[PDB]
Amino acid sequence: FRNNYDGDTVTFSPTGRLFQVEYALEAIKQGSVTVGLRSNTHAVLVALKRNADELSSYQKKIIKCDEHMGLSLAGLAPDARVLSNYLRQQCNYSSLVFNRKLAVERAGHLLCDKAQKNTQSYGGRPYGVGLLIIGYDKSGAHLLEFQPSGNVTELYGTAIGARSQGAKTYLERTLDTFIKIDGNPDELIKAGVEAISQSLRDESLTVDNLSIAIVGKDTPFTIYDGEAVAKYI
Amino acid sequence: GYDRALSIFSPDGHIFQVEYALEAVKRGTCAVGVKGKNCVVLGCERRSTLKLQDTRITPSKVSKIDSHVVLSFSGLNADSRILIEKARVEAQSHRLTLEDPVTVEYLTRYVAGVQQRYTQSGGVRPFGVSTLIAGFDPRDDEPKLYQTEPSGIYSSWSAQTIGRNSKTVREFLEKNYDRKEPPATVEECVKLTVRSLLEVVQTGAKNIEITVVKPDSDIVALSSEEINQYVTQIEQEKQEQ
Amino acid sequence: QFNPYGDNGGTILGIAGEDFAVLAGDTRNITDYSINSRYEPKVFDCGDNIVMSANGFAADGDALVKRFKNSVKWYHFDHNDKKLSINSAARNIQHLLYGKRF
Amino acid sequence: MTDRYSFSLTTFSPSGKLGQIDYALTAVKQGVTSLGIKATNGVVIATEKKSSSPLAMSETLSKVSLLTPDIGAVYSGMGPDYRVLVDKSRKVAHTSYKRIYGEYPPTKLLVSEVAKIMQEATQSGGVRPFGVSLLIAGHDEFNGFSLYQVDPSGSYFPWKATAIGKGSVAAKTFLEKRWNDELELEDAIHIALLTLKESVEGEFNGDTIELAIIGDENPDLLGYTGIPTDKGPRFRKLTSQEINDRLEAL
Amino acid sequence: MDIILGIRVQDSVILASSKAVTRGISVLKDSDDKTRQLSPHTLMSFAGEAGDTVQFAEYIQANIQLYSIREDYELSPQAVSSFVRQELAKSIRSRRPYQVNVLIGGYDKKKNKPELYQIDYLGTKVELPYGAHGYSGFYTFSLLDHHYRPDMTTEEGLDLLKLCVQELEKRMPMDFKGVIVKIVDKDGIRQVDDFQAQ
Amino acid sequence: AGYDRHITIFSPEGRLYQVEYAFKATNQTNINSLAVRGKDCTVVISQKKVPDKLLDPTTVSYIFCISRTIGMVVNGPIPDARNAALRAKAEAAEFRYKYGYDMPCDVLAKRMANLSQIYTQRAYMRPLGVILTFVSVDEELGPSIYKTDPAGYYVGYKATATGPKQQEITTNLENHFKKSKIDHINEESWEKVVEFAITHMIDALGTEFSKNDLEVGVATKDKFFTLSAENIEERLVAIAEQD
Amino acid sequence: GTGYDLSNSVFSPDGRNFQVEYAVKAVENGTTSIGIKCNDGVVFAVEKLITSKLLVPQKNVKIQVVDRHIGCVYSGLIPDGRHLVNRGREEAASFKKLYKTPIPIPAFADRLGQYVQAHTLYNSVRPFGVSTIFGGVDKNGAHLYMLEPSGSYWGYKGAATGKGRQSAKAELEKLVDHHPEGLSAREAVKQAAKIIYLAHEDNKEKDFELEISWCSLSETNGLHKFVKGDLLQEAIDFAQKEIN
Amino acid sequence: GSRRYDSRTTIFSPEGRLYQVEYALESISHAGTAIGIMASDGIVLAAERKVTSTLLEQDTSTEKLYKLNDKIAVAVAGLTADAEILINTARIHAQNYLKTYNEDIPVEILVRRLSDIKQGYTQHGGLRPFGVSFIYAGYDDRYGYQLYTSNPSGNYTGWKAISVGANTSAAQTLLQMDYKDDMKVDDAIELALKTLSKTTDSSALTYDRLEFATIRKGANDGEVYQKIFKPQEIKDILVKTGIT
Amino acid sequence: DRGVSTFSPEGRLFQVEYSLEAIKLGSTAIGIATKEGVVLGVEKRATSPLLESDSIEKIVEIDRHIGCAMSGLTADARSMIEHARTAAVTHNLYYDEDINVESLTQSVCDLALRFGEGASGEERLMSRPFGVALLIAGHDADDGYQLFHAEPSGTFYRYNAKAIGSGSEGAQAELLNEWHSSLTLKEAELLVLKILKQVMEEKLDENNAQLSCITKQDGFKIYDNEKTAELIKELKEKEAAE
Known part of the structure; x- marks a missing residue:
């Protein structure tokens, strides 16, 4: 079975499955955990940075795309660099040509379409990384979940990566609460850090291990690492 | 339009097409090179699967890249022509833009680069060739000898050999070549070269060609006799014991 | 025949102090003998404490300033938010201008 | 999209055989028999019009085609492959010769061009060889009359007379007995009709047989008068009636 | 223009080329060698457009040296001149043509005879006993037409050139700062360092 | 090796x-069609089967108007059929532009056959699983029927049939022509030629037809058109008053 | 032998293209969606599974517009559906630029048709993993279409695809019989909402969100618009009511 | 994709x-x-x-x-x-x-x-x-x-005498046996025919089965001449050399 | 066969993983960063005594403030070095300044995944991943002394100390215990020499091993054999002292 239909992205299995895409999705599950959640005034990204040795640094997981948009990654870092870069350009094009800030919803559509092309042609391979996009545009705060299959979804909160299921259940429970944490960034962050620690197991979030990002009403997308995240540990 | 990846990694980390390219070199006639104190000598063995050839016109195993540098090889003859031509063109281009002929290391690095490129470009197979490049840098008198292989890796040697039975002749050289006192003479250098070849050629006056390279574009190939004379004097060193 | 250039007038002035610098410019924009605007900003804050003004053919001046501001933005993206030094902006601008040497 | 088949589909096997060419030859063997006989003052090529249904109009399907006014062709094997080869042959006779020298090419050279086209389908990327063998007959001032055979490999050879397809072995043998270097065109036509009769199962007449000749110039088939040096095509397809008249003297 | 002269005597070809390089109002150099050795028995002199001149010469030199290494042989003068003619003929119909005129003097070791080829920027080639490019010919061809002989010695050839140069230094408007003379024969190429007063 | 069955290269048997x-794919629709030549017209008839009640019957057709004068009926899956129809229309329009006159039925047939031959020789292109029957009243040849298949083959016919029960129709037609001794239906009106065609369709298939079980195309001097369900009913009525 | 199903444009011994058939499986595994043709327009509706409380309601729109008069909805691999609509839009823009008039539904149908069919011609590409229902109003009426992964398509009175396609088709068939004179846009909308609720039983495990859109000469001036607010609730109730 | 049908005509075997x-x-x-x-x-x-x-x-x-x-x-x-x-x-x-x-x-x-x-x-x-x-x-x-x-590999070599095609082994041995540096064209002609005569897989060596050519510098001239023998000329030289 | 950019059922790119296996067979390379500079050391590993060891170049200069060591298929590293040198020099032409070490590394890593037979994303013409790993060491005013590990996967990590090659697992364990935020350049040198000695098959001497460092003051320098010979001697002495 599978073995005969998983040679490339241009082959459908007898049950209508695309294995190369499913394998790419597996690289996400092996990636470190990251969480995202939003209220009506702010959107937050929380990520657990993974290190190789105790002599190495913890690889960044959050990338800024514009003053009002950013994302967190889980899976192949290089693919996240390619995709975030494409998004940086799309945000750029929108500003230069129409003097307009790119709608988060539109960014999701562009990402979906870019990923899809890599699941229907020969020679190419699907992107092997998951992305959580947050932003504040003309319709408020937003959170998107991107999957290499090309599926992009808008949520109030979510999580991807290993053991991501813990944080996801916690958020699906805390919903009514954090969705109302308006005009209070520090609270939304704490709400996110609490969600991510629901997927811990190995260790506990430290200072050079935690990474947070926020965007909102009067808050440009900014990234907090190290000492700057101490007050949340 | 053809761009299939022919040279790729296998589970154990090897690139079989490059590895098999080396096998083609092991099958090629033997070639050796030894550097003296004021010269470099290149020796090659001549096959005998068929004999009735016209030596005047049959392409020789040692090629001049420029008036001060030569190249010999082991492996597929046809493939070597491609590298030799490219090297010759690069040598003229270098004189044209830098107003100075190439150094031996530069020429080697160039040939090696071409070989490496053919190990990771689509639609092509690696060169089934290993080379020995020798000569003297412009206005320099220090001898130079380098070797390149299919992978594109290169380095300099006091003496070295490639091709069939190169294992044997290398041993002879490792325990017959003293870095403390390199063959201080064109003669004793050509002698060490002929000796090492006899270890594998099995009596072949006409199966052994030699080329001597000295400073300032002084390159010349010995004739059968000149060589035959070296063989004779050497078979005596043995019998005189 | 079509002439790709125009002249919008205007004058700008830059003076460097010991620990400060100023860049001034009139706000009038013109075409031949008419005034297009009495207030059309010609000097801009480009970020990283750099002010710029490209005077002459306004359309070209706008394109250049726009392209430089975008250059600053990408400089941050590609070099971990490093601040673009004034000497570095100057060199960058040389390549922007020389890119259209013809 | 984009043809990504840039590699050969015909390659050498360990025994030295080129499989695809051998297989194309096998397709030629299953084809209806066709033949050609060279006389002292002309050439005849013929084949059977194996109609694929009585409702089909066998005349709308020509197995014998004019390539130039003095050169014709016939085949055995895959009819559709033949059809496009004829289109290409007619065109190359112009692009590689008439538009350069202002005259039609001599038989051997046009044959040479066709052969080249076929050889390329044997090595070029992404294609299979043509599944046909051709018999090309013609005339030109300096070589006189000639007859050639072109196989799927691109190889071609001149003949005094020969046959290809289904019963080529038996037909070649029958031709070796009746051929001599003194035959007149009418004699060759007669020999052609006799040879073809052994290969045909059912009806044998001017409506089931297709035959053409390269003989004298036909000023009546030129289309205009006024230029002495222009005498007309040497290629002529016999009519159903002309064939029957000769079948009675069979 | 610059002075480019050539003359084929009994057993050699002599090439004479002016030493000045003038740009506008100033003579920038007075020891310019307007020649390139293409092979041990083939020499080429050139004059014309500022940059194209040397770029063309050096390009031709590179190609001939490449041919020499690849074949371990030396192309005959006639072969080299034909190669040079084709290059110039291609150039005249390109986007930006090489505006270069040349003289090719070589000694054919197989025939044992000296040869002189004159080729202009259009690819116009002709073989002659003596030649010149530019305005020089206007004063020298009548001189040589008068004093030239096929059996002249290399020495008689040099006295003939001296005569040509004196006429040029008398009637031509520009100061070309003398000439550099080179001899091409069965032994190769040598430069007559003593012509500033021979 | 076994790949000689996946792409268009020869098998050891040539x-x-x-x-x-x-060729197998051409019967996937389980439809039969036939064409006959009148004195000065050409008729094509094809079964019409609309199983699903949710389908808009008016959009289910295998007959196409290629040009003002050429009609085409297809036997095979509809998507490959539409691919062929679009290409044929483009080819016909282009021919008129470049050569100044209407593309003849037999020429379009040859052109489409050549295109098919190519899919047969080049590996990257697959053959279209269809058989195309072209009809018209050519200005030089008169009533015409030319059919092409996935092998690149094409020929002209006095009459023809295509589909699962092609053979039964063919022999029925052959028998009629052995009898009449002429290569066409000797009728002045196209209406009677349509009736002859439907009549023999019924005899050979041993089935009765309602106005929605058929599809008809007619070719006349300077025009090819298709009949409406009602024009067909009028035809069915006339044949009923004879049996 | 075997292996006929490993490469996209290969004909199997029985004349089939297995890769296209496998694409169909991806479609049947998808959400259910439908289309209803009324007396002067068309209505589209689709089932949107609620994976979790986290999905912001009414935010993940699935129905798409082409030009200003065409609606498209699909079941299967959502990204493939978008890809197809992007092409559809370029196709519509191209037609308007050259001919001025907005593209006729039948013409648009073939444009999508030829493109989808093209993806069954080579082994270098994969067939589309979606079935699409689209249509709108043009110079001469309303038109509803459904396009399969093979590039096959026809005009319809009603159409359905996806998980609960059978239930939907049964419901659509009843309507066709009980309304030979034609359904009204207003009625079609409610009827559409009902059919989706009934067809949701083939996926009753997860909760879902309803989405409807329509294009009617009288109700929307022939432009494609989404059913929102009051008209939407009124339709949801009509369904919730007849589900019991 | 296409990679499936690629024979890879240009690769090395494990033996190089x-x-x-x-x-x-x-x-x-x-x-x-x-x-x-x-x-x-x-x-x-x-x-x-x-x-x-x-x-x-x-x-x-x-x-x-x-x-x-x-x-x-x-x-x-x-x-x-x-x-x-x-x-x-x-x-x-x-x-x-x-x-x-x-x-x-x-x-x-x-x-x-x-x-x-x-x-x-x-x-x-x-x-x-x-x-x-x-x-x-x-x-x-x-x-x-x-x-x-x-040959096919692109390798080339020079010879005094050589053969290619069928039975080169047997032919090379015969040539190596009777070839002599001082030979003359007419001697060569005879050596060539004799060698082919002993290696032919056919009954006898007749003129209709041969092609012959020589490159001589015809003394009475000073230039080089290529002579591609005609049937009759081959028939002649076949009799003279004693093969009739 | 199987595409060069195919995913395994575990979500890994076959060719990239197999690439890592080739790097494990390469000569060892070690790098150590201190507040006084960064040290880079490699195992020459000549294959025969007739091979002139100094012609073995496994430590190369990228720019005055950046140097690097390689391990694995060393021939594959040339185009990477060429790209890095060009990126550094080009950055200086465009901005009149030194390129940051991290930026230079990111640029080299951008080349990594540019392989395939026709991957839809640009024009990645390179048939296979690079079969070599690199240690990039340098200094810039913003982040000081740095050490990076660039792999054929395109990912790069910053390390305080790192070993790559045949003896990496062993050497890395050793570095884990020996490294501390206050090592001096001298300590680092000896430390690199020591670890190389433990993992090398041959007895470490100034001919089969090579050292180098990069300091803000003098830039990247490759230690000549005489200087390293002394450091070898000094190391033997301190080890034999207990």
Whole structure:
């Protein structure tokens, strides 16, 4: 079975499955955990940075795309660099040509379409990384979940990566609460850090291990690492 | 339009097409090179699967890249022509833009680069060739000898050999070549070269060609006799014991 | 025949102090003998404490300033938010201008 | 999209055989028999019009085609492959010769061009060889009359007379007995009709047989008068009636 | 223009080329060698457009040296001149043509005879006993037409050139700062360092 | 090796399996069609089967108006059929532009056959699983029927039939022509030629037809058109008053 | 032998293209969606599974517009559906630029048709993993279409695809019989909402969100618009009511 | 994708051999034998025509001996059609050289060029090699009479006498036995015919099964002449040498 | 066969993983960063005594403030070095300044995944991943002394100390215990020499091993054999002292 239909992205299995895409999705599950959640005034990204040795640094997981948009990654870092870069350009094009800030919803559509092309042609391979996009545009705060299959979804909160299921259940429970944490960034962050620690197991979030990002009403997308995240540990 | 990846990694980390390219070199006639104190000598063995050839016109195993540098090889003859031509063109281009002929290391690095490129470009197979490049840098008198292989890796040697039975002749050289006192003479250098070849050629006056390279574009190939004379004097060193 | 250039007038002035610098410019924009605007900003804050003004053919001046501001933005993206030094902006601008040497 | 088949589909096997060419030859063997006989003052090529249904109009399907006014062709094997080869042959006779020298090419050279086209389908990327063998007959001032055979490999050879397809072995043998270097065109036509009769199962007449000749110039088939040096095509397809008249003297 | 002269005597070809390089109002150099050795028995002199001149010469030199290494042989003068003619003929119909005129003097070791080829920027080639490019010919061809002989010695050839140069230094408007003379024969190429007063 | 059955290269027996399988695809629709030539017209008839009640019957057709003068009926899956129809229309329009006159039925047939031959020889292109029957009243040849298949083959016919029960229709037609001794229906009106066609369709298939079980196309001097359900009913009525 | 199903444009011994058939499986595994043709327009509706409380309601729109008069909805691999609509839009823009008039539904149908069919011609590409229902109003009426992964398509009175396609088709068939004179846009909308609720039983495990859109000469001036607010609730109730 | 049907014509075997080259050589070994013998005053080329019939027009036939220059010729062993492709490019290369330098092309330079073309099909492009082996007979004013051989691999070598095609082993042994450096063209002609005569897989060696050619510098002139013998001329030389 | 950019059922790119296996067979390379500079050391590993060891170049200069060591298929590293040198020099031409070490590394890593037979994303013409790993060491005013590990996967990590090559697992364990935020350049040198000595098959001497460092003051320098010989001697002495 599978073995005969998983040679490339241009082959459908007898049950209508695309294995190369499913394998790419597996690289996400092996990636470190990251969480995202939003209220009506702010959107937050929380990520657990993974290190190789105790002599190495913890690889960044959050990338800024514009003053009002950013994302967190889980899976192949290089693919996240390619995709975030494409998004940086799309945000750029929108500003230069129409003097307009790119709608988060539109960014999701562009990402979906870019990923899809890599699941229907020969020679190419699907992107092997998951992305959580947050932003504040003309319709408020937003959170998107991107999957290499090309599926992009808008949520109030979510999580991807290993053991991501813990944080996801916690958020699906805390919903009514954090969705109302308006005009209070520090609270939304704490709400996110609490969600991510629901997927811990190995260790506990430290200072050079935690990474947070926020965007909102009067808050440009900014990234907090190290000492700057101490007050949340 | 053809761009299939022919040279790729296998589970154990090897690139079989490059590895098999080396096998083609092991099958090629033997070639050796030894550097003296004021010269470099290149020796090659001549096959005998068929004999009735016209030596005047049959392409020789040692090629001049420029008036001060030569190249010999082991492996597929046809493939070597491609590298030799490219090297010759690069040598003229270098004189044209830098107003100075190439150094031996530069020429080697160039040939090696071409070989490496053919190990990771689509639609092509690696060169089934290993080379020995020798000569003297412009206005320099220090001898130079380098070797390149299919992978594109290169380095300099006091003496070295490639091709069939190169294992044997290398041993002879490792325990017959003293870095403390390199063959201080064109003669004793050509002698060490002929000796090492006899270890594998099995009596072949006409199966052994030699080329001597000295400073300032002084390159010349010995004739059968000149060589035959070296063989004779050497078979005596043995019998005189 | 079509002439790709125009002249919008205007004058700008830059003076460097010991620990400060100023860049001034009139706000009038013109075409031949008419005034297009009495207030059309010609000097801009480009970020990283750099002010710029490209005077002459306004359309070209706008394109250049726009392209430089975008250059600053990408400089941050590609070099971990490093601040673009004034000497570095100057060199960058040389390549922007020389890119259209013809 | 984009043809990504840039590699050969015909390659050498360990025994030295080129499989695809051998297989194309096998397709030629299953084809209806066709033949050609060279006389002292002309050439005849013929084949059977194996109609694929009585409702089909066998005349709308020509197995014998004019390539130039003095050169014709016939085949055995895959009819559709033949059809496009004829289109290409007619065109190359112009692009590689008439538009350069202002005259039609001599038989051997046009044959040479066709052969080249076929050889390329044997090595070029992404294609299979043509599944046909051709018999090309013609005339030109300096070589006189000639007859050639072109196989799927691109190889071609001149003949005094020969046959290809289904019963080529038996037909070649029958031709070796009746051929001599003194035959007149009418004699060759007669020999052609006799040879073809052994290969045909059912009806044998001017409506089931297709035959053409390269003989004298036909000023009546030129289309205009006024230029002495222009005498007309040497290629002529016999009519159903002309064939029957000769079948009675069979 | 610059002075480019050539003359084929009994057993050699002599090439004479002016030493000045003038740009506008100033003579920038007075020891310019307007020649390139293409092979041990083939020499080429050139004059014309500022940059194209040397770029063309050096390009031709590179190609001939490449041919020499690849074949371990030396192309005959006639072969080299034909190669040079084709290059110039291609150039005249390109986007930006090489505006270069040349003289090719070589000694054919197989025939044992000296040869002189004159080729202009259009690819116009002709073989002659003596030649010149530019305005020089206007004063020298009548001189040589008068004093030239096929059996002249290399020495008689040099006295003939001296005569040509004196006429040029008398009637031509520009100061070309003398000439550099080179001899091409069965032994190769040598430069007559003593012509500033021979 | 076994791949000589996936792409269009010869098999050891000199066969092209992919072409043979494409021929198999032409019967996937389980529809039969036939064409006959009148004195000065050409008729094509094809069964029409609309199983699903949710389908808009008016959009279910296998007959296409290629040009003002050429009609085409297809036997094979509709998507490959539409691919062929679009290409044929483009080819016909282009021919008129470049050569100044209407593309003849037999010429368009040859052109489409050549295109099919190419899919038969080049590996990256697959054959279209269809058989195309072209009809018209050519200005030089008169009533015309030319049919092409996935092998690149094409020929002209006095009459023809295509489909699962092609053979029964063909022999029925052959028998009629052995009898009449002429290569066409000797009728002045196209209406009677349509009736003859439907009549023999019924006899050979042993089935009765309602106005929605058929599809009809007619070719006359300077025009090819298709009949409406009602024009067909009028035809069915007339044949009923004879039996 | 075997292996006929490993490469996209290969004909199997029985004349089929297995890769296209496998694409169909991806479609049947998808959400259910439908289309209803009324007396002067068309209505589209689709089932949107609620994976979790986290999905912001009414935010993940699935129905798409082409030009200003065409609606498209699909079941299967959502990204493939978008890809197809992007092409559809370029196709519509191209037609308007050259001919001025907005593209006729039948013409648009073939444009999508030829493109989808093209993806069954080579082994270098994969067939589309979606079935699409689209239509709108043009110079001469309303038109509803459904396009399969093979590039096959026809005009319809009603159409359905996806998980609960059978239930939907049964419901659509009843309507066709009980309304030979034609359904009204207003009625079609409610009827559409009902059919989706009934067809949701083939996926009753997860909760879902309803989405409807329509294009009617009288109700929307022939432009494609989404059913929102009051008209939407009124339709949801009509369904919730007849589900019991 | 396409990768599935790619034979990979240009890869090494674990032993460092080129499959396609080795198989093309195997193909060559079944072709009519071709012999080349170089003498002091000329060169001889002789080849056996593989397969023949009574009806084969031998006068208008050429399948093994081709004129490349007025001074260079080749004998062919292998696929005739592949050979014509290479022969034509060689004829072009020769004319290009003459146009550039106004001198006929040196034999080795033309041979090297053709060999390089063959080598290319061996390292890139994914196409099958040419199934051809050539024996070149030519003359130039630098090396005089020359004899070369090239095969599918692109390797070429020079000889005093050589054979290609069928039974080269047996033929090479015979040549090595009776060849002598001081030979003369007429001796060579006889040696060539005798050798072919003993290696033929046929009953007897008749004129209709041969092609013959010589490159001599006819003393009464001073230039080089290529003579491609006519049927009658072969029949004659066959009787004289005592083979009747 | 199987595409060069195919995913395994575990979500890994076959060719990249197999690439890592080739790097494990390469000569060892070690790098150590201190507040006084960064040290880079490699195992020459000549394959025969006739091979002139100094012609073995496994430590190369990228720019005055950046150097690097390689391990694995060393021939594959040339185009990477060429790209890095060009990127550094080009950055200086465009901005009149030194390129940051991290930026230079990111640029080299951008080349990594540019392989395939026709991957839809740009024009990645390179048939296979690089079969070599690199240690990039340098200094810039913003982040000081740095050490990076660049792999054929395109990912790069910053390390305080790192070993790559045949003896990496062993050497890395050793570095884990020996490294501390206050090592001096001298300590680092000896430390690199020591670890190389433990993992090398041959007895470490100034001919089969090579050292180098990069300091803000003098830039990247490759220690000549005489200087390293002394450091070898000094190391033997301190080890034999207990």
